Write a protein that holds these residues in place. Structure first.
Motif, PDB file in Angstrom:
ATOM      1  N   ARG E  79       0.850  -1.189   0.000  1.00  0.00           N
ATOM      2  CA  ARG E  79       0.000   0.000   0.000  1.00  0.00           C
ATOM      3  C   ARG E  79       0.883   1.235   0.000  1.00  0.00           C
ATOM      4  N   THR E  80       0.282   2.390  -0.275  1.00  0.00           N
ATOM      5  CA  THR E  80       1.012   3.648  -0.174  1.00  0.00           C
ATOM      6  C   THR E  80       0.176   4.672   0.567  1.00  0.00           C
ATOM      7  N   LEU E  81       0.870   5.577   1.248  1.00  0.00           N
ATOM      8  CA  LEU E  81       0.270   6.767   1.833  1.00  0.00           C
ATOM      9  C   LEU E  81       0.921   7.964   1.159  1.00  0.00           C
ATOM     10  N   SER E 116      -4.573  14.970  14.009  1.00  0.00           N
ATOM     11  CA  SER E 116      -5.459  13.916  14.488  1.00  0.00           C
ATOM     12  C   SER E 116      -6.427  13.461  13.410  1.00  0.00           C
ATOM     13  N   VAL E 117      -6.814  14.348  12.493  1.00  0.00           N
ATOM     14  CA  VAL E 117      -7.680  13.915  11.396  1.00  0.00           C
ATOM     15  C   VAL E 117      -7.037  12.761  10.632  1.00  0.00           C
ATOM     16  N   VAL E 118      -5.735  12.859  10.364  1.00  0.00           N
ATOM     17  CA  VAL E 118      -5.074  11.811   9.594  1.00  0.00           C
ATOM     18  C   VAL E 118      -4.700  10.636  10.486  1.00  0.00           C
ATOM     19  N   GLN E 119      -4.171  10.918  11.684  1.00  0.00           N
ATOM     20  CA  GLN E 119      -3.744   9.843  12.575  1.00  0.00           C
ATOM     21  C   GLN E 119      -4.915   8.952  12.960  1.00  0.00           C
ATOM     22  N   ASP E 120      -6.054   9.551  13.299  1.00  0.00           N
ATOM     23  CA  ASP E 120      -7.217   8.832  13.790  1.00  0.00           C
ATOM     24  C   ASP E 120      -8.240   8.557  12.697  1.00  0.00           C
ATOM     25  N   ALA E 121      -8.014   9.063  11.487  1.00  0.00           N
ATOM     26  CA  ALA E 121      -8.912   8.825  10.355  1.00  0.00           C
ATOM     27  C   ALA E 121     -10.366   9.113  10.710  1.00  0.00           C
ATOM     28  N   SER E 122     -10.575  10.184  11.468  1.00  0.00           N
ATOM     29  CA  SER E 122     -11.915  10.657  11.733  1.00  0.00           C
ATOM     30  C   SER E 122     -11.986  12.129  11.360  1.00  0.00           C
TER      31      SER E 122
ATOM     32  N   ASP F  92      -6.669  -0.356   4.901  1.00  0.00           N
ATOM     33  CA  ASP F  92      -5.822  -1.320   5.581  1.00  0.00           C
ATOM     34  C   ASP F  92      -4.604  -0.668   6.218  1.00  0.00           C
ATOM     35  N   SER F  93      -4.497   0.656   6.142  1.00  0.00           N
ATOM     36  CA  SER F  93      -3.340   1.355   6.683  1.00  0.00           C
ATOM     37  C   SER F  93      -3.329   1.308   8.206  1.00  0.00           C
ATOM     38  N   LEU F  94      -2.126   1.247   8.767  1.00  0.00           N
ATOM     39  CA  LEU F  94      -1.945   1.204  10.211  1.00  0.00           C
ATOM     40  C   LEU F  94      -1.935   2.610  10.791  1.00  0.00           C
ATOM     41  N   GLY F  95      -2.381   2.719  12.044  1.00  0.00           N
ATOM     42  CA  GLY F  95      -2.317   4.004  12.716  1.00  0.00           C
ATOM     43  C   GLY F  95      -0.901   4.536  12.796  1.00  0.00           C
ATOM     44  N   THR F  96       0.056   3.652  13.077  1.00  0.00           N
ATOM     45  CA  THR F  96       1.445   4.082  13.164  1.00  0.00           C
ATOM     46  C   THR F  96       1.930   4.625  11.820  1.00  0.00           C
ATOM     47  N   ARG F  98      -0.042   6.022   9.396  1.00  0.00           N
ATOM     48  CA  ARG F  98      -0.682   7.322   9.209  1.00  0.00           C
ATOM     49  C   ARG F  98       0.006   8.400  10.047  1.00  0.00           C
ATOM     50  N   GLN F  99       0.407   8.052  11.273  1.00  0.00           N
ATOM     51  CA  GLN F  99       1.060   9.013  12.156  1.00  0.00           C
ATOM     52  C   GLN F  99       2.432   9.400  11.625  1.00  0.00           C
ATOM     53  N   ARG F 100       3.193   8.410  11.166  1.00  0.00           N
ATOM     54  CA  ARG F 100       4.459   8.678  10.501  1.00  0.00           C
ATOM     55  C   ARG F 100       4.271   9.667   9.352  1.00  0.00           C
ATOM     56  N   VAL F 101       3.218   9.483   8.553  1.00  0.00           N
ATOM     57  CA  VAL F 101       2.998  10.377   7.418  1.00  0.00           C
ATOM     58  C   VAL F 101       2.632  11.777   7.892  1.00  0.00           C
TER      59      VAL F 101
END
Lengths: 126, 126, 126, 126, 126, 126
Positions: E79-81, E116-122, F92-96, F98-101
């Motif tokens: 996957r990619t971010l 937090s929007v991105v970290q928590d995806a809310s 399917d992305s992990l919280g860690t 997303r936080q890194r990004v």
């Protein structure tokens, strides 16, 4: 050569032109450093390679100097002064030959009478 | 200014261009001294005054460097290298402004990267 | 890697190819130093990165050697010899794998029997 | 006579008119020194020699003084004042006669009553 | 500015992005140091000039973080971010103005709720 | 996260953006506090969740800074500067991850060379 800053003198100070863009046509665009976008001197430099059915190289360098003034509390460009140099040589040309042309262009543009033609807005006459 | 000899340097020697002719259009023609007519560098310098319905001045200076070689025991010009400088300014321009443009033209034509663009036949790139 | 002179050898003399252009397609054009544009050996080197859908890199390198002989008083290219190397690798490829392939390419182009195929113009048979 | 600065006086200050152009009709154009092209005082001086059939010389000198005032932020010439001297003499004329006429012209243009005609804008009557 | 290494922090460690090249469009490409091609973080930065018609500058910056699965010799991107930042400013904008914009962008990107929007995806709600 | 004032800094002063609207598309609109509606800085923040078929989240944040100057007696926006951040990640992305990004995005927007690209309006070259 490698695209880089171009430092040229306007008779009183040194002006640094920073690389800005490179066309699909290969034109290198530059712009003046530490100056407003609208009032910054800009310089474009390209070299048309010869056609498949031609053998003529065209090196074109256009320099533009705007003059911005405040009209109705809105900065606008009243007048621009332009200068275009086109050097033109053939595919079978020798390195010594185009070096001679380069140096002649330099001496020409530095020659006091030619500079006076533009400074004083007076053709050569007789 | 008063028409006179123009002495410019080709990187190795000094070349003297003698006055030759003056058009009905006001173009000053020159030609290289002590050299065959066909192989002599020549330089034309004119300044179009603005129209009655215009306010734009055009100072044009064209320099031509021929290369003559002996083809069939007949001296012929294989290739010529040309350089055209056009400076363009408005009737309401200030003396300081067009002096700045003159000096910028000088520094530009003397700048090592610009000279290398023609000497090495390599556009600016990135 | 950085753009700079590429110095190669023809078994007798070292030819210096100077960096001359970077294409809009990403092609690094080099030209032989101290030789007329027409008769200079030229080298083009590009690394086509993969499409959004694909994952295949193409590394293409074309060397062109012209054979210029004088016809009358006019220098003309009688014929040309061309060499084209093309390396394909995928994005999941390892650096060690790519390096192994590069070394194999070197060893191959230096191998006596392949050099003989090109020199003697006789293929491998019997 | 040789072409050079013409320094005239306006009763208060000396205005220096610099040689700027020699027309194709033989007209020597001069322009005021240290003043914008638009607002500079200009002087034209020509000596029309006689035709092959005729024997009449015309010496014409036109002085133009503009009045430039700022309209908004734009400098504009509100009005102009013009003076035109025209001296006619024949080819059989003597130098002493021409000189007598030149001195009379000087004395006339310096004479109190004519200067008063132009200053006070009242003609000679009663 | 001048192309060079870009070091950025991911909250746990410093990550060095080495420059690769600058393509015809003007995009400067960077690749994570000391990591496989497939799994390396990538950064692209460009400043698109305005057209001859328009006056809008576009500063685009794209960061790409892949997640790769390796089983034996099979290496695949699972996957990619990605994150892409575009700053638009006009030709007549002040350096002061776009400096305020740069600092506001930095503050937003650091702001706890935006992160937090991105970290928590809310989204923002409540 | 909960909806509340977003306080950001422009390098000199802290601007407080008050929550003003939640769009029907899920967009959180904020407006600058203590400033006329026309001249207020506004910020929109939305988290587009993936389709039934897809698995891709888009987090979009648009900051708009207007430049309002008085024209006559009428306050008018002369120009605007805009910044748009868009983060894409899969379900399917992990919280860690997303936080890194998010941290990389912060470090990137604070980095000297990118801030210089926007401030000096010069891209990365040479």
């Amino acid at each position: 050569p490698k695209i880089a800053n171009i430092v040229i003198n306007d008779g009183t100070k040194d002006i640094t032109l920073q690389p800005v863009n490179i066309d699909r046509e290969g034109v290198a665009h530059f712009r003046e450093k530490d100056v407003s976008i609208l009032e910054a001197i800009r310089l474009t430099v390209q070299l048309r390679q010869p056609s498949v059915n031609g053998n003529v190289y065209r090196c074109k360098a256009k320099l533009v100097v705007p003059v911005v003034e405040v009209v109705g509390n809105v900065r606008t460009t009243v007048r621009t002064l332009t200068e275009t140099t086109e050097v033109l040589f053939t595919q079978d040309s020798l390195g010594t030959e185009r070096q001679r042309v380069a140096n002649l262009t330099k001496s020409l543009a530095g020659h006091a009478t030619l500079m006076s033609v533009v400074q004083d807005a007076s053709p050569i006459y007789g």
